[model samples]
Target: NECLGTIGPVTPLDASDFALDIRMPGVTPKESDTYFCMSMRLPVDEEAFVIDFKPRASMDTVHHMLLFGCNMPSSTGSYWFCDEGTCTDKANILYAWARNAPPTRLPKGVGFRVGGETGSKYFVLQVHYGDISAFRDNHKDCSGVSVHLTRVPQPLIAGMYLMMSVDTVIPPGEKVVNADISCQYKMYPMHVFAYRVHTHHLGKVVSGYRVRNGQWTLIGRQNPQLPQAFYPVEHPVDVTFGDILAARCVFTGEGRTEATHIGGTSSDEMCNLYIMYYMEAKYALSFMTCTKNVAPDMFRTIPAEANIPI
Candidate 1:
């Protein structure tokens, strides 16, 4: 509620504007680690901008929820059990919430374009229920997010650039392991206003940086054990083409007796860094990602002048 409250009359849009709620329709959980997806078609008559996201869920049941803007949803039913791919055509992550994360309010004059001719005419809500053993009875859960929308034109359009590693492995008895991902930015100039890092239980520290001309600037860093929320950057970073964007995830295999590979289940491991940015453009980038394997040579590409978290 605090994240989506009124911000005075600075912009043309106000708190009284329309709020779109996309959630599951009282679905019963079958078992643990259940991923349920629901789709809703947006208003196609007019163009709108999403300014904020307010999540509604319980921490004990819902582990995480990811909102995606899609051109074509995977199924035509009301709700379906889905894995990674929920959108058949174009799928872009608009917002993510977990661990009782609070609502996210976009900066002034920045929003995600939706409806009308935008590719995101449909919205898909993906909810991950970790432990559903308590809801074995006729219990039904409705978890979703409410997005504040405005018709006012925004100068800056929002987008998400994901940095992840799919081939990283954590060997048994290893105290420390690092998963690195780096790629040269070849898109238009954008301003990174916020970031969110994701990992499983073994993650310790996750950091992201922007390298330009041998100088590495810290975008954001956080401990993955904390609440998984999109935190505002201390200083907004301006990234252009040719800048190197890199992320490193520190993991420890202290209690693991078996090797863990990256997968969708909670027993496996995952490394992800979501960079949320804004640009003065007509449309946002479509499903952009930077991925790499776990290798020592990955660290060599990073300059010595850079300060990577150990």
Candidate 2:
């Protein structure tokens, strides 16, 4: 155990206002606790964030942590938890996929749920140019590539991310995008996180919602300009039976571009929305990773052959 410092007070949040996004990238700039996770750390018994990150695309940013005199600490740099539980313990996760898009070219890429017992808590957004090379070279940058991290736990919340060009250039068009989420069987109707969409100069607005009892309601929406690469409008809503969630994008650039999926055997981008729900000492799961890719057809359960576009 480490020395005992004052356990800071817990922060309060308003549940009624689901529009506010509690999930944000924090960075600790205090000159004191550098490499605190390795040596000369802060005392135990109290929980304090030694390091933090900013939600932006910059290789120059970094976060630091240190636990004073931490010898046999119960938890450390990494751990995992199952996401199949309630908000308290959830493993129902989902991964993003394009519309029958190629696996390799999937927007961001794919997520790996590496936790079971004493599960793999922390998540690393390593650059998969081939393996875990680019990520290691600049581990900090990898995690800060514009993805949001939620409950799942602290370190494991090291969210993996992907940022597509808002400009209708690179691959072409604004890359119109949306969201696709799937969770574990046990985590059917509940989850800890929701959806958020973003875009660039070529894009206009993005919106997504769920269909419950024939009523279409909004879950999240955003309007990103060159000023704010993307917009994040948080809306906490629950999904139920045949409760289909869908996404749509409006572009102003007129550049011909459509969004794609992330993750597969090869070059995937992973622009879909995914939130880590349970990331503990032995297990790691997200509401957005490791599941069937969400496609437009997944909701259109209608027999494909029966309804021909005559």
Candidate 3:
């Protein structure tokens, strides 16, 4: 609760405060690895800011949950079967949780702007169910998050910038494998306050950096097998348009006999870096993610100083 104010942390919201409880409606998954998405219209009449996220899930059944703010949802029904395309237009990540991660609280005066003219009129909750054996025994899950919102405006509006590699492949019998992704930022300048790295079982270290004029500055790095919480950066980074943002994930395939490819299952591999930033403007950047199909030799073009474990 470092992000909280002097007031003590609140689990369930206060009577006066608002809470958007986006959750599954006790639905049972059909397969061992399944993803379910539910969408709901937001309160578009008034403006609000999301201050905290309270995740309700268990590690045994739920692999992860991602809450997205969108202009138009993918389906009009109560729920749908999907992986990541829950939003049809202007889909942006609001909050994510996995691996028994704890609740998240935004900094005292900063929150994610939503509703009204912000164009985020819908909320989509995507839950990944890793096990369906319990569901076969008449067990249902409502894994999602409680988004605490406030009507009073804040000084800064927060947003998420996700960088990931979609075509990651780790060969067998290798001690070290790196999946790298880089893209130029094309949005307004924003200040990065926190970051979260994610990977599957074989992940060792994940690192992100900001590159400008052949100079690289470390943004965040961590072992993805930990709590997978969004930790505050040591120093805030100001990213401008045309600046290059890069990330790398290190994996080890020593014990495996087959190559690992990127997929949604726990057995497969994934490399992701989530950056939480804030801007003084009213609306955040429209472009939220930077994904690429990076080649194996992409790091050779990157400067040596940007390499991890050097």
Which candidate has the highest lDDT of all? 1
RMSD of each: 5.7, 15.1, 6.4
Candidate 1 is scored at a TM of 0.79
> Which candidate, 2 or 3, would have the higher lDDT against the true structure?
3
Query: Over the full model, what C-alpha lDDT does candidate 2 score relative to the true structure?
Result: 0.29
- CA deviation > 4 Å runs, candidate 1: 1-17, 30-33, 45-47, 58-63, 88-90, 116-118, 129-139, 282-287, 292-310
User: In TM-score terms, which candidate is top?
Assistant: 1
lDDT over C-alpha atoms for residue 110 of model 3: 79
Compare candidates 2 and 3 on TM-score and give the better one. 3
TM-scores of the models, in the order given: 0.79, 0.34, 0.72
lDDT of 2 by residue, 226-286 (tens): 2221222244355554665454444432343543333321122322333212233234333
Q: Which consecutive 10 residues in model 1 have the weakest lDDT in total?
A: 1-10
Give model 3's clash tally. 0
Tell me the lDDT of model 3 at 19.
72
Ranking 1 against 3 by lDDT, winner = 1
* Per-residue alpha-carbon lDDT of candidate 1 for residues 233-289, written as tens digits (9 for 90 to 100): 899999889888888888888898899888877779988888889988574553468
